[PDB]
Amino acid sequence: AVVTQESALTTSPGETVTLTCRSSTGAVTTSNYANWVQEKPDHLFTGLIGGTNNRAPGVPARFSGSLIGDKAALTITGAQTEDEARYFCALWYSNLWVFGGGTKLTVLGQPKSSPSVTLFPPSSEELETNKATLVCTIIDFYPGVVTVDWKVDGTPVTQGMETTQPSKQSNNKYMASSYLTLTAREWERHSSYSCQVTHEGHTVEKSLSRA
């Protein structure tokens, strides 16, 4: 059994939103004891709903769990700004527990903002070491969701790319950075390098030509 949830959702403060949890194997039922937990900054978890309906003590009335469709659902009636968190769901399959991938929920507390991207070439000092680390910095983007894709000579570089996960900023915006590692030999063989960051449909591509 696989448990699927929406990647991300975005609401504005005061609106009602619904997050769902689908079961690979079949209809979610009462005996899967649908569970909902929230994850806040600095990996702070707290249980919201248990047993498909039951609100943990202390959790505000705003959150509700239920079954709608062949799925388990969490509705946040009149979503508040402090509700921008990650929501995970868990289902019991009479032996084990299966957690879904989590839903990055966004409550717009400020205008949408595009990422400030910048690509750095590999330093001299580094190439000496037979290493070539291309750094792509992604900044002041809001919502906190980005997709990074790397291209070497127009071909999508399928590997050697590691990407950090979004992290808040004091202005409650987010950052991330991606890395592209190659050997100094690899690097020589190519002349066009590109880091393309997509955010809410709009793709910003910062490139560089080596030769």
Partner: protein, 213 residues
């Protein structure tokens, strides 16, 4: 007031063993179903194990069966988890949760790696650059260190605004951090910029001045 606090996580070499603890407060362990859950670097949640109350069954994730053992210590109001033929896959923040995951502990990190190493700092300068906003972004690559943390600063506090330090990244048993600064094209190259990095563990102190490419 219920309190959970796990301890025991440390670096460990692949194939090594560990034993984590979860001390409970606010309730009596015996009559409470407790679980172990792990959050990976990918920021994904995974069920590790559950032990039912009364004196009932204990269930294990397929990814954990045979290698990990859960134990209760009702006498000390402690929950234990033994980890034995450790794999790269097992590196994560481990947490214990109460019945139906209402209360959670703060987590304990277990890193399955090779060994301690001071960082290789690299300065990042723009490639024969321009100035869009009459603003230039400089940086610093803090590479191949172990274990975490690292302290990056710029002109040692002088530069505070325009600083973006990115979370670490672990690839071949070693971390990779990156830091940056944005400055008007007035300050650099006219004035110098230095990234100050300090690796506590290793008692490493390095300063890299960012000069033109």
């Amino acid at each position: 007031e219920v309190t959970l606090v796990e301890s025991g996580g440390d670096s460990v070499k692949p194939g090594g063993s560990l034993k984590l603890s979860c001390a409970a407060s606010g309730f009596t362990l015996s009559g409470e179903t407790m679980s172990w859950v792990r959050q990976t670097p990918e920021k994904r949640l995974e069920w590790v194990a559950t032990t039912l109350s009364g004196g009932g069954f204990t269930f294990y994730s397929a990814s954990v069966k045979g290698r990990f053992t859960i134990s209760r210590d009702n006498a000390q109001n402690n929950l234990y988890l033994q980890l034995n033929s450790l794999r790269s896959e097992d590196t994560a923040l481990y947490f214990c949760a109460s019945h139906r995951f209402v209360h959670w502990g703060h987590g304990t990190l277990v890193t399955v790696s090779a060994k301690t190493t001071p960082p290789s700092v690299y300065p990042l300068a723009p490639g024969s650059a321009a100035q869009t906003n009459s603003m230039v972004t400089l940086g610093c690559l803090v590479k191949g260190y172990f274990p975490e943390p690292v302290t990056v600063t710029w002109n040692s506090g002088s530069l505070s605004s325009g600083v973006h330090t990115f979370p670490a990244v672990l690839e071949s048993d070693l971390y990779t951090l990156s830091s940056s600064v944005t400055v008007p094209s007035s300050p650099r190259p006219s004035e110098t910029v230095t990234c100050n990095v300090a690796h506590p563990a290793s008692s490493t102190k390095v300063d890299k001045k960012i000069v033109p490419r």
